Amino acid sequence: AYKIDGNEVIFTLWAPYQKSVKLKVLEKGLYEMERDEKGYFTITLNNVKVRDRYKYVLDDASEIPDPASRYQPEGVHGPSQIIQESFNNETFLKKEDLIIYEIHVGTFTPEGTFEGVIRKLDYLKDLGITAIEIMPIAQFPGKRDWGYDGVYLYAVQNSYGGPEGFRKLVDEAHKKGLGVILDVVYNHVGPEGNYMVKLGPYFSQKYKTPWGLTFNFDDAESDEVRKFILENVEYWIKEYNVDGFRLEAVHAIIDTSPKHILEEIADVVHKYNRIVIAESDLNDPRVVNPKEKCGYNIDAQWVDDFHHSIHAYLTGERQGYYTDFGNLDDIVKSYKDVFVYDGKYSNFRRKTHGEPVGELDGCNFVVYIQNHDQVGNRGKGERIIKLVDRESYKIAAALYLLSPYIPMIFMGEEYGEENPFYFFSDFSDSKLIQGVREGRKKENGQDTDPQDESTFNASKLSWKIDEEIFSFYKILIKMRKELSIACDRRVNVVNGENWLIIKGREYFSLYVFSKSSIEVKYSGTLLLSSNNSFPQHIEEGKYEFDKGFALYK
């Protein structure tokens, strides 16, 4: 990194593999750097200002961007740039009022920039969302990427609007009473434009993940790599005033140290009173358990079991991981016990999977019927709206929005967006271009070309409003708040062949998947319905209901 110190600025580069490194300040000089014995290279300079461009030149004369670059104006292979130094001591977000909205900046808006998301803030606020979640903005190759190919952990993507656009987005979100959560990647680096391998043991020689290589957290020289990650979390908070984080694939962050890097990450976010959420495929409560119960004390985790159980039941799909799901029983299991695989044999995984969650309340978990993976990892990128009828879509929306868990809405879901969301990338390396095309075709059955611009264009939201769907979402969100549904796992669930009744402290819901005669054990007054066949006031008794959903107070 660099540190601005009055009128001077000190450049620090960690590079144990390197005998000697030069700082090349574009159009100024080449400056020999001083080397300490742990292999940190330094110089303090007097003639450097905001906006100056630089690179490092290595033993073998080759020139590289700063791996801790704060800005890559010309992309992943261009020079690094010096930017203005910048936060609130607290996030105003309360974990239990959290309703999350997932945004891919590039496709969210015709603009495809942060400014584009600023334009939608009033709309999001009025919808009833309390936090936006931004998919990764760490600089990745070209302009079209989900974000997981990011390769400069500190550098806000140039083509989204860079440092200033992001800072402006968070400032405007705060003015409007909305939090921002940044999706961040601490388990891997993208395959194009990363130069760390030339500098030191950033990557493990011990571990292989689905992704491939991973960061080195527990082997020789790993102190400095732990710092690189820990300082990154601190950086987003101080420099951008971010409210929280969503950690990509924590099951791929491998650490056998006495104290797990995941626990240290949560320490950093909590020291600054922020929130962290984990994407975890472990079904293991240690991720969110407090330290006194041997956990990392992360605030919440994504629970795919909830999505899968709804998706597989409603669609009839059993391909890939859906094979582990499909029964109505699975939805009730996840509504009661959170995990469906809570220590039970998985045919998909060919092993016993998961662990019960205990008495953890609902706000340690996040659920959804849609997100970038559950749409985008499908070969044809189909939203669930294309896979179920209108009533089923509404029933699915109710099931998660009225659950004890923190709900996350996928951009466009709420107004009935029909456009696909495809996997797209924007590599320039011809081997990587070939690999991604072949891999997406073989693994996902993707027929559109990930590297074709029209694949990105087809994934852009249309903003074509289905008013009836939008109204339904809006009222759901509002009723969730009024009924104090959030976090509260004290629910009673009854099911028959083709229906579910779920009762909480203040409400009951009827989810009728197919015309059924149902014994209703409660009295109440109708708050919301997926059609108008349900009565305003219901009393205990037996009723024949058509497909649909009804919420009673």
UniProtKB/Swiss-Prot annotation:
Organism: Saccharolobus solfataricus
Annotated positions for site Transition state stabilizer: D373
Any one GO molecular function term: 4-alpha-D-(1->4)-alpha-D-glucanotrehalose trehalohydrolase activity
EC top class named in words: hydrolase
InterPro entries in UniProt: Glyco_hydro_13_cat_dom (IPR006047), Glyco_hydro_b (IPR013780), Glycoside_hydrolase_SF (IPR017853), Ig-like_fold (IPR013783), Ig_E-set (IPR014756), Maltooligo_trehalose_arc_C (IPR015156), Trehalose_TreZ (IPR012768), Trehalose_TreZ_E-set_sf (IPR044901)
Binding site for substrate: 246-251, 304-308, 372-377
Coiled-coil region: none
Keywords: Carbohydrate metabolism, Cytoplasm, Glycosidase, Hydrolase
Assigned EC number: 3.2.1.141
Active site residues per record: E248 (nucleophile), E279 (proton donor)
Subcellular location as annotated: Cytoplasm
Main location as per UniProt: cytoplasm
Record's catalysed reaction(s): hydrolysis of (1->4)-alpha-D-glucosidic linkage in 4-alpha-D-[(1->4)-alpha-D-glucanosyl]n trehalose to yield trehalose and (1->4)-alpha-D-glucan
Protein's UniProt name: Malto-oligosyltrehalose trehalohydrolase
GO (cellular component) term, any one: cytoplasm
Pathway given in the UniProt record: Glycan biosynthesis; trehalose biosynthesis
GO biological process: one example: trehalose biosynthetic process
Family: Belongs to the glycosyl hydrolase 13 family.
Complex formation: Homodimer.
